[PDB]
Ligand binder design. Structure first.
Ligand SMILES: CC(C)CN(C[C@@H](O)[C@H](Cc1ccccc1)NC(=O)O[C@H]1CO[C@H]2OCC[C@H]21)S(=O)(=O)c1ccc(N)cc1
Lengths: 99, 99
């Protein structure tokens, strides 16, 4: 389908056995979620946004259900103010911008 | 047009006779541009994202052109690391997300 942008484009995602709301964010390179538990190995990384840098945990090959797709993605976990779906996952579900 | 998200979605914008590169960002409520001079009244605004908050200047009713689509829109100016086109302008040019 098609999603307009008068409202913040939140979608429900299923990850780590949890249901979460996350913002579809074409301005994000990466998918970044608030503090949560995920299984498996991780490595720490620094990322930066509008306000400066934060430390995140990088989990690879994490299954995510989003917009009717069964995806597998890298997920960063850390102190973001909002769960964000970045282009790494938007590309994987065939999402595009159109005007 | 239609824009894939395998690369960052930068487009050329025209504002006040200036050409700039800006990110089409569905995660941003409002357009925010790197430090520049604009005419007319402004008021301070706080915005927030990854890494914290920044103070910006809010200018209303500024003409901006994107890929031949003209809008009159609110433009925030301040210490963003990148020029960002937000939902307030994306809606005015008819931009949607498509799966
Ligand atoms: C965190 C979002 C809810 C809001 N942001 C827009 C977002 O697209 C920024 C836009 C952005 C882009 C580059 C640099 C700074 C901000 N991207 C971002 O923080 O992504 C980070 C995770 O992926 C990495 O890729 C880029 C930075 C990392 S924001 O830049 O803070 C912002 C907030 C409010 C307004 N009006 C305008 C912009």
């Amino acid at each position: 389908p098609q999603i307009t942008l008068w409202k913040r484009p939140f979608v429900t995602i299923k990850i780590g056995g949890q249901l979460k709301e996350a913002l579809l964010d074409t301005g994000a390179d990466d998918t970044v979620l608030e503090e949560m538990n995920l299984p498996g190995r991780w490595k720490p990384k620094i990322i930066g946004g509008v306000g400066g840098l934060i430390k995140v945990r990088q989990y690879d090959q994490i299954p995510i259900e989003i917009c009717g797709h069964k995806a597998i993605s890298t997920v960063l976990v850390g102190p973001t103010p909002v769960n964000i779906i970045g282009r790494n996952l938007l590309t994987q579900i065939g999402c595009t911008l159109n005007f």
